[PDB]
Amino acid sequence: SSSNSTGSYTPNGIKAGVSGDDPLSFLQGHIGWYYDWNATPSGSASGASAVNMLWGAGTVDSTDASRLSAFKALTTAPQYIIGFEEPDCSTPGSSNIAVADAASLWDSTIAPWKDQGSILISPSMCHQAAEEYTKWLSAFSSQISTSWDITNLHINKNSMDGVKTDIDYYYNTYGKPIWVTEFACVDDSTDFVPCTDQSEINTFINDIVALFESDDRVQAYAYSTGEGLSPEWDMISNGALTESGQTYLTAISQYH
């Protein structure tokens, strides 16, 4: 053996993860990792790694303020840090940060942990592969002094062709391993229309989990439990695991 992160780029050798705390009790034993958009996840699961996150710059609302303040009070080095949630968007549950402000915060507040072994995951673009035209991440990449280890994607698509478009764009541009920190069935061909048909949702979840497992560029992925998606996409409903939640669980259980 030879003479650095404690963590692997695929946490615990399981690509599959989840966003949010309510799902953990249900997915435990079949996921490598989890996060809940807080500085530290409030939930816990044996067998999986907690992933830390800095959601934003701390001014969108009092939750943004609370998360930045918790992140600055960390005294124990994260294994993994996810960067800002959709700083390129201004709509609900997006962090809405100008490039220059985000670069400075990344460098001052996230980057120092790399020295302690933390794996750095980039901010997520809401614009997906249209980041080619909006140029938020590309300008951010130019302005930061400490780069990321792992390129962070949000995939909101309704076909594997669209999923591949996103992975291709980000892999061809940066040549770094990818984490899909949120995916959802959404028709984005025209505007942003979340999928509502359960049968199409099931096919999507089964298809995308197979794609991600087989794609060596994708080192981790997580089902989105974020805001603005269809009720049929909800993983949890009145404390129960929904059909969509069960389709994800069954799909990731074929692997681990």
Experimental method: X-ray
Query: Are 31 and 16 contacting, i.e. CB atoms less than 8 angstroms apart?
Result: yes
Resolution of the coordinates in A?
1.6
Q: Where are the domains of the chain?
A: 1-256
The C-alpha atoms of residue 135 and residue 139 are separated, in whole angstroms, by: 6
What's the count of helices (H) and strands (E) in the chain, helices before strands?
Answer: 8, 12
Query: Are 112 and 72 contacting, i.e. CB atoms less than 8 angstroms apart?
Result: no
In Å, what is the CA distance from 189 to each residue of 86, 128, 159, 171, 220?
Answer: 19, 12, 10, 22, 25
Strands (E), 60-192: 80-82, 119-121, 151-157, 178-187
DSSP run (H or E) holding 167: helix 160-174
Query: Are 192 and 162 contacting, i.e. CB atoms less than 8 angstroms apart?
Result: no
The C-alpha atoms of residue 169 and residue 10 are separated, in whole angstroms, by: 21
Phi, psi (5° rounding) for residue 64? -60, -45
120 pairs with which residues across the strands?
Answer: 81
The C-alpha atoms of residue 161 and residue 166 are separated, in whole angstroms, by: 9
